[PDB]
């Protein structure tokens, strides 16, 4: 069948110092896919990791192609856009919707950690939605392997986005990968339920962070969050990564298992 390998780039999904992401439509089938275009003028690692990903809550990789200095990564398209845009500033979103998004986020993260991969930059802007509002973890440009041959490798590179980064990243030379992603997910949950980020960064020099450690939950954004989800947040946003709740236990949390959302 001729022409089936032709794709028209009909829209720019995202840009920035790294290249661009275009929406591509198959000339024959009209199938939609996202194409990351990078001017070689990192990539090899991202591709390697993407080839390992196979899960309903993680953006799928279809393959790559290059023409000299330009690389083309074909990825699953998420027409729903960023979870970020579903968050109402200073408000958040309905608790049931946030719980559903959180459930899917955990599934994706559990999967990644299961194959020894850490995303390192979990935030609403990197969590995409498909046509059915199903969450998809995207952009593995900062991801890396933390477990190989069943042996865990401690991390030491500072990666991520300050508001979402765990405190140990700023205070310790080495740290475990998993608690870091757990922390990020907690910040994402906060955002979904309060429509605002708790602090610029998790450091003792940051007043907002000191207040949280001092348990002043009567201040925003904590006061806008119901007691059930707030209790979970008290277990996730724990400064000591060794004391921080793990995913297996998040799955046992009361709010996590609380009936709230009717099926579609």
């Amino acid at each position: 069948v001729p022409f089936v390998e032709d794709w028209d780039l009909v829209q720019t999904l995202g840009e920035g110092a790294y290249g661009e992401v275009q929406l591509a439509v198959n000339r024959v089938t009209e199938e939609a896919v996202a194409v990351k275009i990078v001017d070689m003028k990192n990539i090899k690692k991202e591709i390697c990791i993407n080839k390992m990903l196979n899960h309903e809550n993680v953006v799928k990789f279809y393959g790559h192609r290059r023409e000299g200095n330009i690389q083309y990564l074909f990825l699953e398209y998420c027409s729903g856009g960023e979870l970020f845009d579903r968050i109402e500033p200073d408000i958040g979103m309905p608790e049931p919707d946030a719980q559903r998004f959180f459930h899917q986020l955990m599934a994706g993260v559990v999967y990644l950690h299961g194959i020894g991969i850490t995303h390192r930059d979990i935030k609403p802007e990197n969590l995409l939605l498909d046509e059915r509002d199903n969450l998809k973890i995207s952009d593995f440009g900062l991801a890396t392997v933390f477990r190989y041959n069943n042996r865990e490798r401690l991390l030491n590179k500072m990666c991520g986005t300050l508001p979402y980064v765990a405190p140990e990243l700023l205070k310790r030379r080495e740290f475990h990968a998993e608690p870091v992603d757990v922390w990020s997910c907690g910040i994402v949950l906060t955002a979904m339920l309060a429509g605002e980020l708790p602090w610029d960064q998790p450091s003792d020099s940051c007043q907002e962070y000191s207040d949280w450690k001092e348990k002043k939950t009567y201040l925003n954004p904590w006061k806008k969050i119901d007691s059930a989800p707030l209790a979970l947040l008290h277990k996730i946003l724990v400064e000591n990564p060794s004391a921080r709740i793990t995913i297996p236990d998040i799955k046992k949390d009361r709010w996590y298992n609380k009936p709230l959302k009717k099926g579609a």
Binding site: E5, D6, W7, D8, L9, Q22, A24, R65, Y72, F74
Partner: peptide, 5 residues
């Protein structure tokens, strides 16, 4: 603009 698969 376009690309090949």
């Amino acid at each position: 603009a376009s690309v090949s698969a």
